[PDB]
RNA sequence: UUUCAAUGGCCCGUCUUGAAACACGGACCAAGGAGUCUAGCAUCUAUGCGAGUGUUUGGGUGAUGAAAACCCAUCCGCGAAGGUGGGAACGCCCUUGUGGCGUGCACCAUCGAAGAGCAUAGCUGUUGGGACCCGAAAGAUGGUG
RNA sequence: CUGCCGAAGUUUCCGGAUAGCAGAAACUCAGAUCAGUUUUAUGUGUAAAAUGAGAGUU
RNA sequence: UUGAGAAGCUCAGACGAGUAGGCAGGCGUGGAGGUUUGUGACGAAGCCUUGGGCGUGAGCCUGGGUCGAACAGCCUCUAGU
């Protein structure tokens, strides 16, 4: 049982081509969703900062975005992560606020029945 | 009579934890010297440039 | 035994070509010694640190005057020492960190060709070597 | 100015020289740095001078560039050349060292000629000592080891030889040979000290 | 070149045996035909950098094959954690030469208590892997009459 | 295919680790040590003249 | 005096068995990047031949006869050599 990496330049170009069709389908929105900033859970890397999965419910409510719409404007949700330190709430709320600063939202046509 | 066998298990963790921070510090300390230890401009090399 | 370098650095076959003439046309032992060490393998030419050179010239009674240290091999620096002294050094290679440190505060660095045109007979030169054990 | 001196065609390198005619006659003080930048341009003007007849006419043109400079900065113009030839002397290659030998031969003769001219205005001992101070902080300085000996042996070889040409009738008493006597005394290049008198042609008949 | 004249010379390979003796293998010709490919380790040398070192997991990119080349983000691996004399080389000499006066590398004696790697390529070595090539009844699973 | 070097063929303990021979490198010396050497002489061994060769290490 | 492929040229002396084994320089085959502004229907490659040469040798160059569409020297790369 042996594996060869001859398709390594083939697979990389397939991935790039897979990104370009995604960009074609969804033009204005970025090819990647926003991710939060979290700290690795170990004494070795705890002083580091990296990306998370999504923004917890305290990070959404504090920033001012409901949890239902957040999934629609590209902000992802992590029901499992929680905020134990306020610096973790702060680094990710401002991460949301800077995102909503640059976020153009296209209006959608809405059904308007004659009566009500 | 010493700690525990799994308490010496953490002895690597108090040995390996200060690896990443040491390595990151070595990266910036090397770069800091690089800014310091650079050759001056040689003002005679703009005669033609 | 050794009378042709195993190297293929074309410029080392020009440096040897200069010190083959000097060794056989002068009566100095500095040239006969320099030529021999241009034949030595990379293993036999240890790096010699700047601090080790700084200690050797400024050793015991100091009185460095303006002697030129000569070593066949690299001269890597020593960030563990802050104040480098004035030094005139000749070597095959420097390290960009070291060569800047010599140049920035003090004298100058030289290649083996610039030493030869100044002291073809080894006139007032210290010939050092790095620690071989490694 | 500077770029055109090192041009790749003589029809434009030549025109830079007489455009340098007015520039070097300016009646204002020139810093050393401006002369060093200029001299690189002039050093590369001579670098590609092809024909032997031409490359020995240009040396005489460049030697003649000395007396036309203002009297104040004539020393600085001479000093930079000896500095700008000492550092790039190692760069030259055997076929291109037969013209900088002569070029240095011309300039070292032009230094004596300026002394003869300035002897008519001021005291000979005063100007010669000032020129002697030019050798003290330049080519004949013991503090810097960066200076090649090939120029220093050359200067000793042609020192007195061009002294006779500048003074056909006789040379007056002066410290003409002081730079060597201040080098074979305390220079730290023991090979240069040891073999300088053997190539000098020093005579003390007038000194 | 064929042939003759004079002088000569026990069939080759293996194996055996001090050696042979041997016993083998050889009817002849052509073609095919056996230290290879790879991972690990150590050594020597070459190269790049050097208290550092290593782009190729991946991303960026590459209009003339675009599986190449070129570029670098976050990690990560491997490193990093004083006197005495003998001494290489040099200077001062000075009866020069001879030697002395010194300065003393690598290192060794002595008393003692101013990092040299990392990566690539090669060579030889070693351990695995089908392991230089050929050759020992197999055994097991599953089928056939 | 040619060229150079070229053993051991066995001590010794014990399938081996040694050694030895051959190399390969690094060293320090010829004003230094040597020798399947020979003398001299002291009591066959030992120690100190000739004859030669540069010799010793890791 | 021209004798700097300094990896060259030149001078002197001694030496030369060889298995196991160690070291070095070369010859040859297929293909690969560079090159010879290379060769080829006025004859490539191949083949035979008591043609002529070259090299200690592995090998090479050439004449003749057949032959009919490809091939090679050099520097490196490479291996089902």
From Swiss-Prot, chain A:
One of its GO terms (cellular component) is cytosol. GO terms for molecular function: RNA binding; structural constituent of ribosome. Component of the ribosome, a large ribonucleoprotein complex responsible for the synthesis of proteins in the cell. The small ribosomal subunit (SSU) binds messenger RNAs (mRNAs) and translates the encoded message by selecting cognate aminoacyl-transfer RNA (tRNA) molecules. The large subunit (LSU) contains the ribosomal catalytic site termed the peptidyl transferase center (PTC), which catalyzes the formation of peptide bonds, thereby polymerizing the amino acids delivered by tRNAs into a polypeptide chain. It comes from Schizosaccharomyces pombe (strain 972 / ATCC 24843). Component of the large ribosomal subunit (LSU). Mature yeast ribosomes consist of a small (40S) and a large (60S) subunit. The 40S small subunit contains 1 molecule of ribosomal RNA (18S rRNA) and at least 33 different proteins. The large 60S subunit contains 3 rRNA molecules (25S, 5.8S and 5S rRNA) and at least 46 different proteins. The gene is rpl13. It comes from the Eukaryota. This is Large ribosomal subunit protein eL13. Its main location: cytoplasm. Belongs to the eukaryotic ribosomal protein eL13 family.
Swiss-Prot record, chain B:
It is found in: Nucleus, Nucleolus; Cytoplasm. Coiled coil: none annotated. Belongs to the BRX1 family. Required for biogenesis of the 60S ribosomal subunit. This is Ribosome biogenesis protein brx1. It comes from Schizosaccharomyces pombe (strain 972 / ATCC 24843). The chain holds residues 247 to 295 of 295 of the full protein.
Swiss-Prot record, chain C:
Signal peptide: none annotated. It comes from the Eukaryota. GO terms for molecular function: RNA binding; structural constituent of ribosome. The modification Phosphothreonine is found at residues 74, 76, 121, 125. It is found in: Cytoplasm. Keywords: Cytoplasm, Phosphoprotein, Ribonucleoprotein, Ribosomal protein. Its main location: cytoplasm. Component of the ribosome, a large ribonucleoprotein complex responsible for the synthesis of proteins in the cell. The small ribosomal subunit (SSU) binds messenger RNAs (mRNAs) and translates the encoded message by selecting cognate aminoacyl-transfer RNA (tRNA) molecules. The large subunit (LSU) contains the ribosomal catalytic site termed the peptidyl transferase center (PTC), which catalyzes the formation of peptide bonds, thereby polymerizing the amino acids delivered by tRNAs into a polypeptide chain. Belongs to the eukaryotic ribosomal protein eL18 family. It comes from Schizosaccharomyces pombe (strain 972 / ATCC 24843). The modification Phosphoserine is found at residues 3, 51, 123. Component of the large ribosomal subunit (LSU). Mature yeast ribosomes consist of a small (40S) and a large (60S) subunit. The 40S small subunit contains 1 molecule of ribosomal RNA (18S rRNA) and at least 33 different proteins. The large 60S subunit contains 3 rRNA molecules (25S, 5.8S and 5S rRNA) and at least 46 different proteins. eL18 interacts with NAP1. One of its GO terms (biological process) is cytoplasmic translation. This is Large ribosomal subunit protein eL18A. The chain holds residues 14 to 147 of 187 of the full protein. One of its GO terms (cellular component) is preribosome.
Curated annotation (Swiss-Prot), chain D:
GO terms for biological process: assembly of large subunit precursor of preribosome; rRNA processing. Pfam families: Nop52. Keywords: Nucleus, rRNA processing. InterPro entries: RRP1 (IPR010301). It is found in: Nucleus, Nucleolus. It comes from the Eukaryota. GO terms for cellular component: nucleolus; nucleus; preribosome; preribosome, small subunit precursor. Required for 27S rRNA processing to 25S and 5.8S. Belongs to the RRP1 family. This is Ribosomal RNA-processing protein 1 homolog.
